[PDB]
């Protein structure tokens, strides 16, 4: 029958994980000469590492794999919430991806898309006036100001930098992989501020007593009635309310990365300018090529027989995301940058699955992938096109054995100029 799994032994791997970061996967597999491993981590319990297409095929197999109840509590309790479509599985949870899909509209895409070109535009001349733009932060801001309106939330001027900031604490809070750090309760401080705005502006919309535009996420949400025609109670529906537009403010995770990459690849400024199709390909290779969600847990359901081991009834399961998008057999040359490999790009749901893979409708794949490529585009056509800068000398390291992926110094600009043919 079927060969043993192998072992990374040990009680607890998590500091280990900790340590090798977005390589510790690969780092396993290499020393192992294996495609698939075991390594106890979370507190002693077992994970089988699967990678690839056909990893993430059989984990997104909803017959086989269980995603309820995998995710740390701690993480839960920070970065999705209570109750967020993140924890829930079957009906319940087709039921209500639903109404997260039904926001992706061609109309809504092309709002968000709108929405981040004059936002940006409108930024120019701040960030002239500016010694210096930390653009991880600068774009944090911008994309609370997108995010919230393009929620249907009115968010004031004069609050968006705390919101700003009490997103990016959530964001963060998956680093110690749901154990304790010191960050741990400001970021659930963090989350109940912003569960305690939300959920008023819920309230307040069922009272009738203010009117978001239809078609907007605090609409759809305060109205919804799930399929045995409850709506969501208050907090919940606040809690997946922010699951509309929090992750849309951790794009900025990405716009950093993206200049980043520009700097490093300047022929890349050059071809967002002259090849109208360039910017989607830099999105779509800031995505792939850059660390940001380092793998992702189920638990088998019964005993899968998988590239040559039986993976037993019970088990964790862990889908590598870093390794698949830097997998050397699906994407050649996978550590370099190279917007140009998406010309021969399949669409496979299986291979980029740096937000998750399989179905939007039916598995826990992140329903706004198609909003982080048009603020991707829109971002890198506006520092490519629309302005100069200089990069000054700074810390541009991204320690990929560091969860979360960050550039050290948040990717810091200067002598920021519009770009204005005046003759
Ligand atoms: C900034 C970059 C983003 C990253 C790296 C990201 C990543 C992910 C990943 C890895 C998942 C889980 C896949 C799984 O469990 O199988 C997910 C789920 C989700 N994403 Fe994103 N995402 C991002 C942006 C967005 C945006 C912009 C939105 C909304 C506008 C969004 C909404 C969601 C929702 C609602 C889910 C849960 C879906 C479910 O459980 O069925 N994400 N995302």
């Given at each position: 029958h079927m060969a043993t799994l192998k072992r990374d032994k040990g009680l607890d791997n998590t500091l280990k994980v900790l340590k090798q970061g977005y390589l510790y996967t690969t780092n396993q597999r290499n020393r192992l000469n294996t495609s698939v491993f075991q390594t106890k981590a979370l507190g002693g319990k077992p994970f089988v590492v699967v990678t690839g297409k056909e990893g993430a095929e059989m984990f997104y197999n909803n017959d086989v794999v269980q995603r309820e109840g995998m995710l740390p509590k701690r993480i839960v309790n920070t970065l999705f919430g209570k109750g967020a479509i993140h924890t829930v599985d079957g009906k319940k949870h087709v039921d209500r991806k639903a109404l997260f899909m039904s926001l992706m509209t061609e109309g809504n895409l092309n709002y968000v898309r709108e929405l981040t070109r004059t936002l940006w535009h409108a930024n120019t001349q701040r960030m002239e006036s500016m010694d210096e733009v930390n653009i991880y932060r600068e774009s944090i801001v911008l994309l609370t100001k997108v995010g919230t309106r393009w929620a249907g939330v009115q968010a004031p001027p004069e609050d968006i930098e705390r919101i700003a900031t009490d997103m990016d604490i959530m964001i963060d809070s998956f680093r110690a992989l749901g154990g304790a750090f010191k960050g741990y309760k400001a970021s659930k401080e963090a989350r109940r501020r912003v569960e305690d705005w939300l959920e008023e502006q819920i309230i307040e919309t069922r009272k009738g007593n203010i009117h978001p535009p239809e078609g907007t996420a605090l609409y759809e949400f305060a109205h919804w009635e799930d399929y045995?025609?409850?709506?969501?109670?208050?907090?919940?529906?606040?809690?997946?309310?922010?699951?509309?537009?929090?992750?849309?403010?951790?794009?900025?995770?990405?716009?950093?990365?993206?200049?980043?990459?520009?700097?490093?690849?300047?022929?890349?400024?050059?071809?967002?300018?002259?090849?109208?199709?360039?910017?989607?390909?830099?999105?779509?290779?800031?995505?792939?090529?850059?660390?940001?969600?380092?793998?992702?847990?189920?638990?088998?359901?019964?005993?899968?027989?998988?590239?040559?081991?039986?993976?037993?009834?019970?088990?964790?399961?862990?889908?590598?995301?870093?390794?698949?998008?830097?997998?050397?057999?699906?994407?050649?040359?996978?550590?370099?940058?190279?917007?140009?490999?998406?010309?021969?790009?399949?669409?496979?749901?299986?291979?980029?699955?740096?937000?998750?893979?399989?179905?939007?409708?039916?598995?826990?794949?992140?329903?706004?992938?198609?909003?982080?490529?048009?603020?991707?585009?829109?971002?890198?056509?506006?520092?490519?096109?629309?302005?100069?800068?200089?990069?000054?000398?700074?810390?541009?390291?991204?320690?990929?054995?560091?969860?979360?992926?960050?550039?050290?110094?948040?990717?810091?600009?200067?002598?920021?100029?519009?770009?204005?043919?005046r003759t």
């Open positions: 045995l025609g409850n709506p969501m109670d208050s907090r919940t529906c606040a809690i997946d309310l922010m699951n509309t537009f929090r992750p849309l403010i951790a794009i900025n995770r990405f716009v950093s990365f993206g200049l980043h990459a520009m700097n490093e690849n300047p022929i890349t400024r050059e071809k967002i300018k002259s090849e109208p199709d360039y910017a989607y390909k830099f999105a779509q290779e800031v995505r792939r090529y850059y660390p940001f969600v380092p793998f992702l847990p189920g638990k088998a359901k019964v005993d899968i027989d998988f590239q040559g081991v039986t993976i037993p009834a019970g088990v964790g399961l862990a889908l590598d995301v870093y390794g698949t998008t830097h997998d050397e057999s699906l994407w050649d040359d996978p550590n370099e940058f190279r917007p140009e490999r998406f010309e021969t790009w399949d669409g496979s749901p299986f291979d980029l699955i740096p937000q998750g893979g399989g179905d939007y409708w039916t598995n826990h794949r992140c329903a706004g992938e198609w909003i982080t490529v048009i603020i991707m585009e829109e971002t890198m056509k506006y520092f490519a096109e629309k302005i100069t800068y200089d990069v000054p000398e700074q810390d541009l390291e991204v320690d990929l054995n560091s969860i979360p992926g960050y550039v050290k110094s948040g990717f810091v600009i200067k002598n920021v100029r519009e770009v204005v043919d």
